[PDB]
Design a protein around this ligand. Structure first.
Ligand SMILES: [Mg+2]
Ligand SMILES: [Mg+2]
Ligand SMILES: [Mg+2]
Ligand SMILES: [Mg+2]
Ligand SMILES: [Mg+2]
Ligand SMILES: [Mg+2]
Ligand SMILES: [Mg+2]
Ligand SMILES: [Mg+2]
Ligand SMILES: [Mg+2]
Ligand SMILES: [Mg+2]
Ligand SMILES: [Mg+2]
Ligand SMILES: [Mg+2]
Ligand SMILES: [Mg+2]
Ligand SMILES: [Mg+2]
Ligand SMILES: [Mg+2]
Ligand SMILES: [Mg+2]
Ligand SMILES: [Mg+2]
Ligand SMILES: [Mg+2]
Ligand SMILES: [Mg+2]
Ligand SMILES: [Mg+2]
Ligand SMILES: [Mg+2]
Ligand SMILES: [Mg+2]
Ligand SMILES: [Mg+2]
Ligand SMILES: [Mg+2]
Ligand SMILES: [Mg+2]
Ligand SMILES: [Mg+2]
Ligand SMILES: [Mg+2]
Ligand SMILES: [Mg+2]
Ligand SMILES: [Mg+2]
Ligand SMILES: [Mg+2]
Ligand SMILES: [Mg+2]
Ligand SMILES: [Mg+2]
Ligand SMILES: [Mg+2]
Ligand SMILES: [Mg+2]
Ligand SMILES: [Mg+2]
Ligand SMILES: [Mg+2]
Ligand SMILES: [Mg+2]
Ligand SMILES: [Mg+2]
Ligand SMILES: [Mg+2]
Ligand SMILES: [Mg+2]
Ligand SMILES: [Mg+2]
Ligand SMILES: [Mg+2]
Ligand SMILES: [Mg+2]
Ligand SMILES: [Mg+2]
Ligand SMILES: [Mg+2]
Ligand SMILES: [Mg+2]
Ligand SMILES: [Mg+2]
Ligand SMILES: [Mg+2]
Ligand SMILES: [Mg+2]
Ligand SMILES: [Mg+2]
Ligand SMILES: [Mg+2]
Ligand SMILES: [Mg+2]
Ligand SMILES: [Mg+2]
Ligand SMILES: [Mg+2]
Ligand SMILES: [Mg+2]
Ligand SMILES: [Mg+2]
Ligand SMILES: [Mg+2]
Ligand SMILES: [Zn+2]
Lengths: 91, 69, 120, 114, 50
RNA sequence: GUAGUAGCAAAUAUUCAAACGAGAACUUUGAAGGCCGAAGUGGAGAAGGGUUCCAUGUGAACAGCAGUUGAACAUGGGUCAGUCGGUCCUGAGAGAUGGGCGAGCGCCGUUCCGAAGGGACGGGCGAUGGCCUCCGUUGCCCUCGGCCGAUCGAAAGGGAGUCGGGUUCAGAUCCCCGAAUCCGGAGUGGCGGAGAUGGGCGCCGCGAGGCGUCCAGUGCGGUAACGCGACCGAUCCCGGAGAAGCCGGCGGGAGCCCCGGGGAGAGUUCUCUUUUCUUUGUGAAGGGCAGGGCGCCCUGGAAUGGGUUCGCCCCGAGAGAGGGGCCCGUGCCUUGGAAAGCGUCGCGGUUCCGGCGGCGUCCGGUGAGCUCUCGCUGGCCCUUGAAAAUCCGGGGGAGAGGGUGUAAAUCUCGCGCCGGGCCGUACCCAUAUCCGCAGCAGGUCUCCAAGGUGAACAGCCUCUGGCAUGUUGGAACAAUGUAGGUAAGGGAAGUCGGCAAGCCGGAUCCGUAACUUCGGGAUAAGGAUUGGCUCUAAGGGCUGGCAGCCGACUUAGAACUGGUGCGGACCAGGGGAAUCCGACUGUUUAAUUAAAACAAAGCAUCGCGAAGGCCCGCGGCGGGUGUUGACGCGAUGUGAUUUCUGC
RNA sequence: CGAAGCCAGAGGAAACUCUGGUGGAGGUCCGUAGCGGUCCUGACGUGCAAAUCGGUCGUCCGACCUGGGUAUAGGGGCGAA
């Protein structure tokens, strides 16, 4: 049921720590706790270890990704550039 | 300790040297023979008094016999 | 002690004026949810372990035990006797139509077989 | 009810002093010292956490006593690989070595007609 | 610990002695366990290849 | 002088009789009345104390009264090991040579500016001695040997392996008896059993057979998971174990509790009570089987998707199902094991006597019960939660061995033999063995923990186990006091201030605003019930060809009853309306203050790309930050949030 | 007290909402052991004591509490000041 109608996951800190702080942690407590869809084992057991490490349950293949999310805006863009500077006519 | 399952196996164990004592303990339904040889206590549990006495007469004479209490 | 405790299991000494903790502390909610849902979730097996209720109604009724629908074993036992009648009513009315499907499939086959025999 | 007392002089609840208790033949409840768990050897590559099968599982200093069947498995890569990685190191060492030969005779043909 | 970055641990082969060497790179983004990091002068330009 | 004065007042307590004794409010025994009440006034230790332990003897000291007593004095006793521990190992660190510095004792420094391995097996030659067959000892020679630097550092970390019973005035896993094991060592190499004797041919023999020839033998079984009593192998290489946080749930096992029955002894019997209490066992080690765990294998492929947890999760990267394998077994039975132990009944023996004897040491049930252990499984972390001595396995193949009716290189298999040095070991471990000047209501690190009430290890009262009111007793019942309790009527009028007291409390059913960062407030406020007994209603478990036996303690309902009494003692939130300060949790002025003071997350500002920022330094380009690199270090102001940041 | 996930019923065309459950996150809340020491401006004040005792209190899964080991020493150490 819609128990807490605005805060969602940040019903654990409760009364305190300021309004706009909890608004700005809610977006990023969700992101590190979700079960991301693994690109290798096909399953959704992507779970992070300690910060910057991501880990899938089946096939047990450990990938360094973002610090809170799995990817980064930097991560896709540098992957975009590095293939593009690779296929630039022999390196 | 260890347990024996053939009377031949225990009789050969009685022939084994580095052994000094055999304890015949008359329990009610069965009777056990116990060699105190070395590092072990070899027990053979047998059901008959007649098998007991003819095992007693098969006992090696250098090995001491003591019937318990 | 035993004399006075024999009175308690009768239901004496256990009103409102001798309880001093919460009823959630005396026999907790989760422990009552464990027991009742181990009562139920093994009866639903022993039905499908024989021919009683099919594989498909089980997992439909399994999750419906996992939700708050059935209060105890009794109304679950009444509810399955409700269900296996309605499977019987669907299958009783279906098979007479399906046999009546069969008589007209085969009569149009027998109009096929006899007329074409006269066509040669 | 017979409240029971340590047999050694380690009165602190330490890691090594981690016990069970048994019942003597004098009807006295004694406090008997438990050897710790011998956790089994797990396998190489670390693809799976989970111990290797068929190995009697004791302390490393115990292992001088056991026989050389209660420490490994009859297979090649006996007590070290998890028996799924053995039958993957077979398939991987075969299928790559075929590709050595194919590329060597493909590039022999690159040195042939070119 | 004491670093917020993750920390890679790359295996090799010593070209002079029959021995495998275990060295510790810094885990750049996107690498996963089981990658063939190829390092040297004429390394082909991908992620992780120094 | 003060003066026979203050004083011997913290934590409920003594009583009667009897013995020894010059001599008894205290010593001893016995009975009653008691309290500590399992977070103990109990059972044992680490630290420290060092003879305090035990026994006997005296009563001048000392024990704040006394003493016939002692932790006093005097005399004499007691502290036993391969498996209990120190030793060994590394952790934070502490520390010599090389080197640097220094007037200098020396400091810096720990791999730094270094010829920092003295070992190896094998080849070789040379010598040597035994039984010069062959071995055994060195000389030097070809080959490897990151020597990643010595060495110290834990009586709580790492660390192979001991149990059960008895014994003393005093010790015990240490002595005795009985039963186990680990680690080393074994020339002429102790004894089996494996590697071990298979096949082809011929010659003859009815065969049994033998003879010769030649070849092969570094083991076997299962499709697999892996299995067995053994299973050639160096330098070197790979890995595992040692080797990991914290908190939840839950399941398995054990201890203790609890229910019924037997049996043994005792408790009451005024009346009842098939009653009430005590007691009712199997060690290490070896083997068998329960039970649990698996992300182990095979068959085979499911959508109408199913399988399952309290919660998930699970799967075409192969589910349910059918059938195996491994690992754990602290559970039960078995060898030990009933000959001991224990209960109770007898009988000797002046005695020593681990006397002798008869009997019993059983049947079950139940669980969110508590503790402990093993395991599953998940949550949290800008928190990812130790090294090493040692030990094992695997991959490789340097060589090594036997030549046949010859048995060798071998061996983690089953036994046999020998040893295991050195130090520590009594006691108190505390309202009387420590420290606080002392037998000081303080201080000091843990393990074990029953019955009743009850949510509970709260508090209250009992058992086992302890004690004797805490450095005194007798008489009386003034003032003052310190604690403690009530008070007609009024209810802050008292005082600087409701200070202190006193209300309210536990529970179920009711009912809940202003205000808000939508989380709250909030157990708001305000209410109603509560006992006793006599019942009903509902919640289950194991077998079946829709029944029958047996099980846990809760939840609602109703009657009747008491003098409207019922959380009947203990146990236990007064409440609102608001103003100022601080976001909160945290911390601080040990001994005059806990605050608004400090910190705090948030917001900013600044330095610095390393021949550098900030710092230490008596010294060297010695050091810390730095096992670092602008999402970082170093330096400050401000102090949650929201809205604002003028000149 | 009941954060996320989660089931089940109900309404909707979508977006999803509404209701009963399950779940057990926190520098949570009432509290014990432990650790602190607000108040009575109480006892005590040639005391039990060169800072105690009794009531009443604060926090009590957390920046916790504590034993042993090691480091830093006098214009020096250390400090949530
Ligand atoms: Mg709940
Ligand atoms: Mg006087
Ligand atoms: Mg006076
Ligand atoms: Mg007398
Ligand atoms: Mg006298
Ligand atoms: Mg009391
Ligand atoms: Mg005590
Ligand atoms: Mg004494
Ligand atoms: Mg005397
Ligand atoms: Mg005196
Ligand atoms: Mg003396
Ligand atoms: Mg001994
Ligand atoms: Mg020098
Ligand atoms: Mg130095
Ligand atoms: Mg050392
Ligand atoms: Mg230790
Ligand atoms: Mg040991
Ligand atoms: Mg003793
Ligand atoms: Mg003994
Ligand atoms: Mg040996
Ligand atoms: Mg259990
Ligand atoms: Mg055993
Ligand atoms: Mg039970
Ligand atoms: Mg002692
Ligand atoms: Mg004291
Ligand atoms: Mg004290
Ligand atoms: Mg305890
Ligand atoms: Mg208790
Ligand atoms: Mg109760
Ligand atoms: Mg007395
Ligand atoms: Mg007295
Ligand atoms: Mg005293
Ligand atoms: Mg006193
Ligand atoms: Mg009055
Ligand atoms: Mg009045
Ligand atoms: Mg009034
Ligand atoms: Mg007024
Ligand atoms: Mg005034
Ligand atoms: Mg007050
Ligand atoms: Mg009153
Ligand atoms: Mg309020
Ligand atoms: Mg104002
Ligand atoms: Mg504050
Ligand atoms: Mg103060
Ligand atoms: Mg601000
Ligand atoms: Mg510098
Ligand atoms: Mg603006
Ligand atoms: Mg709080
Ligand atoms: Mg509150
Ligand atoms: Mg609190
Ligand atoms: Mg309170
Ligand atoms: Mg105080
Ligand atoms: Mg005062
Ligand atoms: Mg005074
Ligand atoms: Mg307190
Ligand atoms: Mg000075
Ligand atoms: Mg501080
Ligand atoms: Zn994956």
């Amino acid at each position: 049921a819609k128990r807490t109608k605005k805060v969602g996951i940040v019903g654990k800190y409760g009364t305190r720590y300021g309004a706009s702080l909890r608004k700005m942690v809610k977006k990023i407590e969700i992101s590190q706790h979700a079960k991301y869809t693994c690109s290798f084992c096909g399953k959704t057991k992507m779970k992070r270890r300690a910060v910057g490490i991501w880990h899938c349950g089946s096939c047990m293949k450990t990938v360094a990704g973002g610090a809170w999310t799995y990817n980064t805006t930097s991560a896709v863009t540098v992957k975009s550039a590095i293939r593009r500077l690779k296929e630039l006519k022999d390196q | 300790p260890r347990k024996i399952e053939e009377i031949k196996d225990f009789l050969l164990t009685a022939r084994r040297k580095d052994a000094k004592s055999v304890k015949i303990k008359k329990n009610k339904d069965n009777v056990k023979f116990k060699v105190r040889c070395s590092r072990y206590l070899y027990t053979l549990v047998i059901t008959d008094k007649e098998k007991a006495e003819k095992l007693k007469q098969s006992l090696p004479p250098g090995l001491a016999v003591k019937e318990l209490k | 002690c035993r004399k006075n405790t024999l009175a308690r299991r009768k239901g004496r000494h256990m009103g409102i004026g001798k309880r001093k903790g919460t009823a959630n502390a005396r026999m907790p909610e989760k422990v009552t949810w464990m027991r009742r849902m181990r009562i139920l979730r093994r009866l639903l097996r022993r039905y499908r372990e024989s021919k009683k209720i099919d594989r498909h109604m089980y997992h439909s009724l399994y999750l419906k035990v996992k939700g708050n629908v059935f209060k105890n074993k009794r109304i679950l036992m009444e509810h399955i006797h409700k269900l296996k009648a309605d499977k019987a009513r669907k299958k009783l009315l279906a098979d007479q139509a399906e046999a009546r499907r069969s008589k007209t499939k085969e009569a149009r086959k027998r109009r096929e077989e006899r007329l074409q025999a006269k066509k040669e | 009810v017979q409240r029971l007392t340590y047999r050694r002089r380690l009165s602190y609840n330490t890691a090594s002093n981690k016990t069970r208790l048994s019942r003597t033949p004098g009807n006295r409840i004694v406090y008997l010292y438990t050897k710790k768990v011998g956790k089994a050897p797990k396998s190489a590559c670390g693809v799976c956490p989970g111990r290797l099968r068929g190995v009697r599982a004791v302390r490393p200093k115990v292992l001088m006593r056991l026989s050389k069947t209660k420490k490994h498995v009859s297979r090649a890569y006996g007590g070290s690989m998890c028996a799924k990685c053995v039958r993957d190191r077979i398939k991987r060492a075969f299928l790559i070595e075929e590709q050595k030969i194919v590329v060597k005779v493909l590039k022999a043909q690159a040195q042939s007609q070119k | 610990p004491g670093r917020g970055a993750p920390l890679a641990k790359v295996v090799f082969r010593d070209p002079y002695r029959f021995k495998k060497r275990t060295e510790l790179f810094i885990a750049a983004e996107g690498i996963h366990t089981g990658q063939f990091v190829y390092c040297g002068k004429k390394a082909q330009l991908n992620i992780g290849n120094v």
